[PDB]
Amino acid sequence: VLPENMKRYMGRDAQRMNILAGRIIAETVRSTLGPKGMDKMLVDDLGDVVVTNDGVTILREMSVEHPAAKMLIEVAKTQEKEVGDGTTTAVVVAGELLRKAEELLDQNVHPTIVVKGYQAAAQKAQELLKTIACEVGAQDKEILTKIAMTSITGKGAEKAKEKLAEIIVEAVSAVVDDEGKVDKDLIKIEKKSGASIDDTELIKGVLVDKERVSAQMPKKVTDAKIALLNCAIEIKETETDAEIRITDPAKLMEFIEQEEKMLKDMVAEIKASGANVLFCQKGIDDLAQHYLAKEGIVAARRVKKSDMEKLAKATGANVITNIKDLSAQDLGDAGLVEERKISGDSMIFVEECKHPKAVTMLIRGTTEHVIEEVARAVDDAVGVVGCTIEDGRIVSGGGSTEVELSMKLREYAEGISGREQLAVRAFADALEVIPRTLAENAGLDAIEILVKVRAAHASNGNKCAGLNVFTGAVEDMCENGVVEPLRVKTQAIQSAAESTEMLLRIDDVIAAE
Amino acid sequence: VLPENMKRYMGRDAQRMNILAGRIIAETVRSTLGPKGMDKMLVDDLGDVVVTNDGVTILREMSVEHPAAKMLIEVAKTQEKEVGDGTTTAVVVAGELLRKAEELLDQNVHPTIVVKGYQAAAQKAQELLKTIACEVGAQDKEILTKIAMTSITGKGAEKAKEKLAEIIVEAVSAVVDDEGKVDKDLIKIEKKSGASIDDTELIKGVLVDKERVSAQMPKKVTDAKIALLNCAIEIKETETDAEIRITDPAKLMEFIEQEEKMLKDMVAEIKASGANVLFCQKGIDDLAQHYLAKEGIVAARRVKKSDMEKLAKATGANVITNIKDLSAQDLGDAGLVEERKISGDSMIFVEECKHPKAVTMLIRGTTEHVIEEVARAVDDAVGVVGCTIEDGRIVSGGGSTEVELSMKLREYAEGISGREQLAVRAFADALEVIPRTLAENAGLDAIEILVKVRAAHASNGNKCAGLNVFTGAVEDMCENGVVEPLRVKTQAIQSAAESTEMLLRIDDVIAAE
Amino acid sequence: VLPENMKRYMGRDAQRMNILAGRIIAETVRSTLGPKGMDKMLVDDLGDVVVTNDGVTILREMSVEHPAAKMLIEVAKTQEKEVGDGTTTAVVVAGELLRKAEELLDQNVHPTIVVKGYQAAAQKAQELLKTIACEVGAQDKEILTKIAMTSITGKGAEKAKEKLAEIIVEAVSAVVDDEGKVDKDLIKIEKKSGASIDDTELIKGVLVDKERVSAQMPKKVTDAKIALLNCAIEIKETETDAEIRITDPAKLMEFIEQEEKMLKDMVAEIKASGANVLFCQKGIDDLAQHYLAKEGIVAARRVKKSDMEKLAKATGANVITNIKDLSAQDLGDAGLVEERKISGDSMIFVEECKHPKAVTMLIRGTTEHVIEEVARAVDDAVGVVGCTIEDGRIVSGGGSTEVELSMKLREYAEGISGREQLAVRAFADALEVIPRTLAENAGLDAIEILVKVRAAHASNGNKCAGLNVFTGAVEDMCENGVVEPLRVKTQAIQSAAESTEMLLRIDDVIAAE
């Protein structure tokens, strides 16, 4: 009936294999988690080497077979889309949550009771986080750099978190404009091996990976008047079936000369517009490039639609269809448009925009994998800054949240009573895996840290606690400026608890080959 | 270097595989544990069907490969040798103890800390059991039948535990004599399919699986004078190389007639002894059986040395070497020696011994597997009666001990503190698997039973608690006469904790094919 | 030319593979070393499970292929024969010594220079140990129990080191007699599963694994007069070819009756000797056992020559050839010779000897592997007591020796200078692997311990230092009674350094399949 190779699990075996598959992933990724966490090297079937610490990236790249591990990946991708970071922490706490669910299965607690206490504890956990949430200015320079920096830490880029925090806060502020909505698509991340991270810099405009089409064109244009054409700049022929019908040896020449005039006039109109920089989304015929050079118009063809839009946003250039339609009102401004070589590669830098809606960050470093890690670090840094601008609530780090939750959810458990108290107690205890693996990976005593931190948390509070693995002792995360967006923590609770309830609800898995 | 097929585990994998192997066995056997526990059918490679509930028997018969499961078997065999029953409970509590040890490994509690708390908790656990131990009369008829009956319960033989308790208490009392030392070897267990368990009966003497060697011999002898010869009763020839040297056609006959006289005289001496019943350990030549019939001497040859000893003990017969040496002072007494057929099989019953030191119990029933289960039930029943005679301390059943221990060891844990408190707390909690699986197998609510029983235990005490799965509610095990030997419980703690420490100490296992 | 499967290494590859093979063994065994060291489970191709901590035993049992690892085994067997323990420490320090030799090979230090500094440092190391050696009374009760106890520690038997130290010191004292020479062969180690280690006891005499040959013989004999016969007690026939030549039907009987008289007379002579206990190295014919019973002589046949000698030594019994030669002057004395069953097995205990030259220690415990570990622990305990009786020098433990050596050999290195100083410095540093792995296995900080201990050693001295892993801090090993025989430490230096020089001298290894 069934293909040899097909695997199927059901009842107790489905639940065991699903809890295992999820926790197995969590076991793999948790060794990267934290300031003292390590990195993974995944090399595909072609030799392509991926060196990263990002959990979701590891999950996307690695070869997963079990359906349960594949659903955990979907959770990781949601966390990636929403906030970027906190993916690993979502997997780990979910892995333990399943571990504790297995303890409840060992206790013969019916799956509907387990998920009942989890649903209850998760609802209260959300209320608790919103209660302890510290409100900050959405555009406050200070907290903007504090959120940025704490995000950057635990990465290779932390060594330069000061320059990066400035770059990312400035980049987001430049493109966000009003108060507000933050669109990460407005910040282009360019990465080019060569130099070091000290050379990484923000360019108020757009870095175009194109060259000056003619040797006769200027190499740099100041106070640039930029035009954006989406049509191809070639000798246009009608869509309809047509051909030249020669009537005289003179006319053979008249037709060729006529076509030369057509294309010459086109360029004459571009010049008449006041344009001196031109970007065409489609191709530009060499003959057109020949005429463009005559008027000193610098040009780049075959430009990506994405960059044509970044140019429109940054320069305020208006995309125009017909060259005859191009007017001064369509032209955008750039302080300087200049052709520059970066580690040999010739690019056109459009910089010093008046009021840019797009910004480009050029990342340098000694190796591709280094600038790739920096690219991931700053992607998350921008993400979490956007999270704190849109949602002006932050919370203390160093595991203070999860500890605060385990405190109040333990008392909540006692209030509930019955078999629900067992499930709620298990949920609250599951949250301690994060503080636990933070210290374990830090090389700190797992037991003594957890006892001292919880004691300090209960006595002094959640704004007077958490673990500072940097000095290797319990400290005050809040006063030390160790804070993260509320959204990170609240989204983790929601998605993890609901996807866990799903896994726990599945009692029959059929995996065809 | 190593044969393909060889498996080796080390560090974390050795510890995981060892904890698993042990718990896997515990998972298999725990479904038989308790009054509502089921039975297992193990059929070997020849078709031989073994139907049993005994954990140690299942472990001996089943095909175990993992070295760790093989060491657990050694634990089960120790429990078998010492007390007979309580084997399954030793495996189960040991399996959970490893489960809790794995939790401690998850907590990063160093293996030397885990075994430290276990060693501490086990030392206190022994003191606790000796403290709550209820002292009873070593020869008290009442407690002798109470211990017997509680042992019998949860077996197929429970239906007749009243008749069996009488049989076993009587059997042990008959053979034990002084106060005392109980030797289970003095009670022979005969089992013959046919009839029912109602027909099972104790015979004050020995059931010999032999027949009357001659058709001319009586079928029953009253006030029997029994002789025990270990020599063969045949025409003796010298050890040394010799042969008959004929000198005359007359002498050919004289030699044959001489040999006839020799053997005739031998039997005449047996008769002269006053013997009329004769058991020979070795063979009896037909010619000797011919003369034995002449004097009306009933005889059985090729008797097992073991039964020759049971006959000496029961009848007070004295094993003699030379027939010429056999005297009245060597003869033992039997009220009746009679040849009886049981389901066709002809046996000689030697019964009504004056002061027997050995007794035989004849077990009947509808099937071999039924009388085999009864044979195991009564083996354990005799065992635990012997345990309570030699060690006049008993304790309340229904999981009261293990609960009492988990109560005081939790407070003990708090007194100890440090990381040792974690290990001691884990030990104390591990003991709850027994109450837990008692109720689970009983079809009772695992959670509600454990809560209500512990609440009742703490409030009323250990002589006013435990679970009565028979009515399906927490009751008073002590008042209900539900008690077991102290030795059962104290030996379980010792052997389980020490063998667990061993397993936990092993970090490298090499299993050659 | 060469069989496929044959491996050969030469020059740099021989030296690398040899250093690796040796260090690989050291890497395997060092995880068992120390009070916090673990145990290994080696299961052969038949299923036989060996559970031990002894390095030499692991090496004997495991499947080693590389010739270099096989030579290290020869080193371990020498250490076993001489002192018993300290085998693992010899392998480990030798493994590091090769590691440091590889560093010197990395430095391009010629193999003859490396072994030159090693030979020099080893010569001084011996002088240093003899200099710090603390002289003690060869028969001093106190140090006898202190040496014994420190040997026992780090074993499962440590839990009962107090009872064991008494047993072993008493056992050695009883058999050693004069001052002196200690022969470990005079102490028999009996091990029988059942009971616990608390039941382990020393018996001043010999435990014979035999039974009373006749049911008619006493079960216990007091003030026993023991005879030792090495001849077989059977109807003797001439060596030469002979047979009985019958001449008359009367003579047929006369010959049989004659043989009966012969054997009867033999036993009559044994009785005439005054003997009432008899041990025969060879067989005893049942007919002889029949006559032996007549005079109330208790007997055991087929006795092992080894035990016949232990009986002669303990009881002062004199082995006699002819029964006719047995006299009262040949008889030995035993206060009690009694047949006892231990976990069912019937043995004869010959105890309460007047002036025994042999003693037997009966070891009990919950499992075979437990009493096997105890058997190894007490074997070593007797060994090291014998080492301290014969060589009345001891040294402080806790790595103080090896530290003292690394201190003075570093200054020695500076005195030597040249390239020899590099080799001598490497030797001195290699000695630190023992303190290093003591702390590593103890779960203590490898760096901080080594720094604090060396600082304390240099400041306070070698009688005011070493690591006490039991409290987990640097302490005073000398004042704490933590001492071991000098021989252990000095033999380790000699054998390790000389076998290392050999390995380092080999530059071509041919291993045929």
Nearest-angstrom CA–CA distance, B302 and B318: 17
Residue to substitute from B16, B92, B108, B432, interface A, most A β-carbons within 10 A: B108
Inter-chain touch B502–C443, beta carbons under 8 Å: no
Query: Which H/E stretch holds residue C408?
Result: helix C400-416
Q: Which of residues 23-52 of C touch B (CB under 8 A)?
A: 28, 31, 36, 38-45, 47, 49, 51
With contacts defined as CB-CB under 8 Å, which chain B residues touch C238?
A: none
Contacts of C430-434 with CB under 8 Å at 24 or more apart are C430/C93, C430/C96, C430/C97, C430/C99, C430/C100, C431/C93, C431/C402, C431/C403, C431/C405, C431/C406, C432/C96, C432/C402, C432/C403, C432/C406, C433/C92, C433/C93, C433/C95, C433/C96, C433/C99, C434/C89, C434/C92, C434/C93, C434/C399, C434/C402
Inter-chain touch A107–B446, beta carbons under 8 Å: yes
Inter-chain touch C38–B505, beta carbons under 8 Å: yes
How close B312 comes to chain C (CA, Å)? 10
Q: Which of residues 408-427 of B touch A (CB under 8 A)?
A: 419, 422
Q: How many helices (H) and strands (E) does chain B have?
A: 16, 20
Closest residue in C to B239 (Cα–Cα): C235
Residue C448 burial (CB count, 10 A): 11
With contacts defined as CB-CB under 8 Å, which chain A residues touch B106?
A: 99
Nearest to A447 among B99, B419, B447 (CB): B419
For residue A341, the SS3 value is: strand
Residue to substitute from B5, B81, B245, B500, interface C, most C β-carbons within 10 A: B245
Nearest-angstrom CA–CA distance, A442 and A470: 9
- Specify burial of residue B163 (Cβ count, 10 A radius: 0-12, 13-18, 19+): middle
With contacts defined as CB-CB under 8 Å, which chain B residues touch C40?
A: 506-508, 510
DSSP B133: P
State yes or no: chains A and C have 3 or more CB pairs below 8 A: no
- Specify burial of residue A309 (Cβ count, 10 A radius: 0-12, 13-18, 19+): middle
For residue A372, the SS3 value is: helix
Residue C202 has, within 13 A of its CA and on its CB side, a CA count of 20
Nearest to B112 among C36, C63, C366 (CB): C36
Alpha carbon separation from C83 to A73, C73, C454 (Å, rounded): 60, 15, 28
Nearest-angstrom CA–CA distance, B187 and B192: 16
How close C4 comes to chain B (CA, Å)? 15
Resolution in A: 7.2
DSSP C133: P
Q: Which residues pair with A359 in a beta bridge?
A: A187
Residues 6+ apart with CB under 8 A from B510: B6, B8, C40, C41, C42, C43, C62
Closest residue in C to B508 (Cα–Cα): C40
For residue B349, the SS3 value is: strand
Q: Write phi, then psi, for C167 (nearest 5 degrees).
A: -65, -45
Q: Tell me which chains share at least 3 CB pairs under 8 Å with chain C.
A: B
Residue A147 burial (CB count, 10 A): 27
Nearest to C38 among B67, B240, B507 (CB): B507
Residue A371 backbone class (left: φ over 0; alpha: ψ -120 to 50; beta: rest): alpha
CB contact at 8 A, B240 and B221: no
Give me the total of CB pairs closer than 8 Å, taking one residue from chain A and one from chain B.
Answer: 18
Query: Which H/E stretch holds residue C227?
Result: strand C220-229
Residue A30 burial (CB count, 10 A): 26
Inter-chain touch C63–B1, beta carbons under 8 Å: yes
Alpha carbon separation from C2 to C433, C509, C513 (Å, rounded): 40, 14, 10
With contacts defined as CB-CB under 8 Å, which chain C residues touch B1?
A: 63, 65
With contacts defined as CB-CB under 8 Å, which chain C residues touch B499?
A: 366-367
Residue with tokens 């009942």: A116
With contacts defined as CB-CB under 8 Å, which chain A residues touch B438?
A: none
| C360 classed as catalytic | no
Inter-chain touch B498–C370, beta carbons under 8 Å: yes
Alpha carbon separation from A9 to A16, A18, A141, A174, A501 (Å, rounded): 9, 9, 54, 54, 18
State yes or no: chains B and C have 3 or more CB pairs below 8 A: yes
Inter-chain touch B108–A447, beta carbons under 8 Å: yes
Closest residue in B to C365 (Cα–Cα): B495
Residue with tokens 């002269």: B272
| B54 classed as catalytic | yes
With contacts defined as CB-CB under 8 Å, which chain C residues touch B513?
A: 45
CB contact at 8 A, B153 and B398: no
Q: Which of residues 74-103 of A touch B (CB under 8 A)?
A: 99
Closest residue in A to B450 (Cα–Cα): A107
Tell me the technique behind this structure: cryo-EM
Beta-strand pair A134-135/C319-320 = unpaired
Q: Which of C85, C330, C379, C380 is catalytic?
A: C380
Q: What is the CA radius of gyration of chain C?
A: 29
Query: Which H/E stretch holds residue A409?
Result: helix A400-416
Nearest to C256 among B238, B244, B309 (CB): B238
Alpha carbon separation from B125 to A155, B117, B390, B431 (Å, rounded): 51, 12, 22, 10
Nearest-angstrom CA–CA distance, C386 and C375: 16
CB of B107 less than 8 A from some CB of A? yes
How close B158 comes to chain C (CA, Å)? 30
Give me the total of CB pairs closer than 8 Å, taking one residue from chain B and one from chain C.
Answer: 128
Nearest to A447 among B99, B107, B440 (CB): B107
Residue A180: is the preceding peptide bond cis (ω within 30°)?
Answer: yes
Nearest-angstrom CA–CA distance, C76 and C84: 9
CB contact at 8 A, B94 and B433: no
Q: Which of residues 3-22 of B touch C (CB under 8 A)?
A: 3
Residues of A labelled as active-site residues: 54, 87-88, 380
Residue with tokens 């830090």: A442
| B178 classed as catalytic | no
What distance separates the 2 farthest-apart alpha carbons in chain B?
103
- Specify burial of residue B312 (Cβ count, 10 A radius: 0-12, 13-18, 19+): buried
Nearest-angstrom CA–CA distance, A377 and A381: 6
Alpha carbon separation from A444 to A36, A471, B313, B420 (Å, rounded): 10, 11, 71, 19
Q: Which of B32, B87, B315, B401 is catalytic?
A: B87
Task: Please report the beta strands in C306-397, taking only residues with DSSP state E, as ranges in sequence order.
Answer: 319-320, 332-342, 345-351, 359-363, 393-396
Quote helix, strand, coil % in chain A, to nearest 5: 50, 15, 30
Nearest to B447 among A99, A419, A447 (CB): A419
Inter-chain touch B244–C255, beta carbons under 8 Å: no
Residue to substitute from C66, C198, C366, C369, interface B, most B β-carbons within 10 A: C366
CB of C262 less than 8 A from some CB of B? no
Closest residue in B to A446 (Cα–Cα): B108
How close B511 comes to chain C (CA, Å)? 5
CB contact at 8 A, C93 and C434: yes
> Edge-to-edge, what's the strand order for the sheet holding C359-363?
C187-191, C359-363, C201-203
Residues 6+ apart with CB under 8 A from A226: A275, A277, A278, A279, A311, A315, A317, A331, A332, A333, A334, A337, A350
Residue A120 burial (CB count, 10 A): 19
> Edge-to-edge, what's the strand order for the sheet holding B393-396?
B134-135, B393-396, B483-485
Query: Which H/E stretch holds residue B41?
Result: strand B40-43
